[PDB]
Structure 1
Amino acid sequence: IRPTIGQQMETGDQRFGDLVFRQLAPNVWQHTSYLDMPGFGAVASNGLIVRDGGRVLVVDTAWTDDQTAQILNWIKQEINLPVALAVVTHAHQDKMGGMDALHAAGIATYANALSNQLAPQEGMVAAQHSLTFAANGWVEPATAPNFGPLKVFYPGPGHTSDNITVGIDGTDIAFGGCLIKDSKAKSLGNLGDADTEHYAASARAFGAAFPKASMIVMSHSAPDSRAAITHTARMADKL
């Protein structure tokens, strides 16, 4: 009995080690990893895995190197294709905590230049390559070679000064990272590094960058429809 990963994922989300995986589209999966906070519930963070022909692309690490190695084990077991590159979406632990695991696997890594400047100070590891964005927010294509379906956009400062977002061409999916929370969220999470003045505008900019994306994928909520974007901007309005 040798079903494909797609066939297996019809049963629903799949636990793998300490992670959870969910198929969002035929070649796109959401990875979820958890930070234990002693005496409280474990904090979930989501990223993406994209099968792009004969290679795999990753958006965001897990919280730690070990959890990120678990992601790479899942990819080997279920997809059995090489991981070419990763884009990581700001200098917080949930997004860049596992860079050492990616680098040791021979994966080429990319982050906002600002994320690469901030990370080492914070005890994290910079990505190998720096993305630069035009004033309009779109990544300068020269800094994002061979990204396949990934379309990288800097929406402005919000959740953090460096936060970036990723559309997946050929699908209904855009990844807001930690900028966007779902349409039922009571909180924007920890705003300690947030630009509270510009947050709402940056959430709006994300929605306007990916107008055809009907599935919004987020770090700290399950996937939602586009109402997540204006809900988040409403929660961020005049903080």
Structure 2
Amino acid sequence: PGDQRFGDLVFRQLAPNVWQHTSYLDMPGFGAVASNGLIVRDGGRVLLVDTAWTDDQTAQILNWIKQEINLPVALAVVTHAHQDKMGGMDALHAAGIATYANALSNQLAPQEGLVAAQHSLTFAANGWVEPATAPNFGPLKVFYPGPGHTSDNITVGIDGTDIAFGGCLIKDSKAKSLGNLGDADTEHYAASARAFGAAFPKASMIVMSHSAPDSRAAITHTARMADKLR
């Protein structure tokens, strides 16, 4: 429903100022794996959440933005140091886009074979980003829910909308598994999922990296699945 195709990527308008971008990477025993991020227009600028898997795909996201919105991309925030979220950093930097990530993601990125963001976010004990480290983030509300899918995973709500982005932390309400748990925190995963729910209590549209947007049942289901990891 409403998928707009552009090159090898897919764009779906979720709200008046919000689109989901989807890119694909072929994987063994697995076929093509979708990864979602977001594109938000805030006034006269565009904000990006997560890159695509590759520089080439990320360049295509920028090309789509230029065609369909034609406003500068003021910044990107990337939600952890895995290829699906940070694989296209060089394309952002080539385009002159300021990039932000959890300080921990920047520390891990090089050894993960990834390029670090230019700026580091740090977080208060309540999980909310220290606002001075997230200048000009506009409607993006950045929240560290605690370790789960990775030690460094972060999440983003969008002010003025019913949308909250769970990244690779949250799976859909009928997901069979929690996906790749290779870098996960099995002890804190469930609490972290519920913390995300708590941080964005009014969000009715939960956007995620590896499934289509869903209701808050995605949060309760992910948390229930994570309970079993303890």
CA RMSD of aligned residues (A): 0.8
Offset from partner CA, 1:104-129 (integer Å, 9 cap, x none): 11110000000000001111100000
Task: Point out 4+ residue stretches in structure 1 off by more than 4 angstroms.
Answer: none
Offset from partner CA, 1:197-237 (integer Å, 9 cap, x none): 00000000000000011000000010001010010000111
Report the Cα distance in structure 2 between the residues aligned to 1:207 and 1:40, rounded to whole angstroms: 30
Q: Per-residue deviation at 1:38?
A: 5.6
Report the Cα distance in structure 2 between the residues aligned to 1:122 and 1:176, rounded to whole angstroms: 21
Report the Cα distance in structure 1 between the residues aligned to 2:40 and 2:20, rounded to whole angstroms: 9
Q: Per-residue deviation at 1:36?
A: 1.5
Give unpaired runs (5+ residues) of structure 2: none
Q: Which of 208, 222, 231 is 2:198 aligned to?
A: 208
Report the Cα distance in structure 1 between the residues aligned to 2:209 and 2:157, rounded to whole angstroms: 14
Corresponding position of 2:19: 29
1:109 and 1:127 in contact (8 A); partners too: yes
Offset from partner CA, 1:30-80 (integer Å, 9 cap, x none): 000000126742000000000111100000000000000000000001111
Offset from partner CA, 1:106-163 (integer Å, 9 cap, x none): 1100000000000011111000000000011000001000100000000000000000
Report the Cα distance in structure 2 between the residues aligned to 1:90 and 1:45, rounded to whole angstroms: 13
Report the Cα distance in structure 2 between the residues aligned to 1:223 and 1:208, rounded to whole angstroms: 18
Q: 1:121 to 1:39 in 2, by over 3 A?
A: closer
Q: 1:158 to 1:24 in 2, by over 3 A?
A: same
1:18 and 1:33 in contact (8 A); partners too: yes
TM-score under structure 1 length normalisation: 0.94
Give the percent of matched residue pairs that are identical in Structure 1 and Structure 2. 99
Report the Cα distance in structure 1 between the residues aligned to 2:18 and 2:45, rounded to whole angstroms: 12
1:197 and 1:238 in contact (8 A); partners too: no
1:181 and 1:221 in contact (8 A); partners too: yes
Give unpaired runs (5+ residues) of structure 1: 1-11
TM-score under structure 2 length normalisation: 0.98
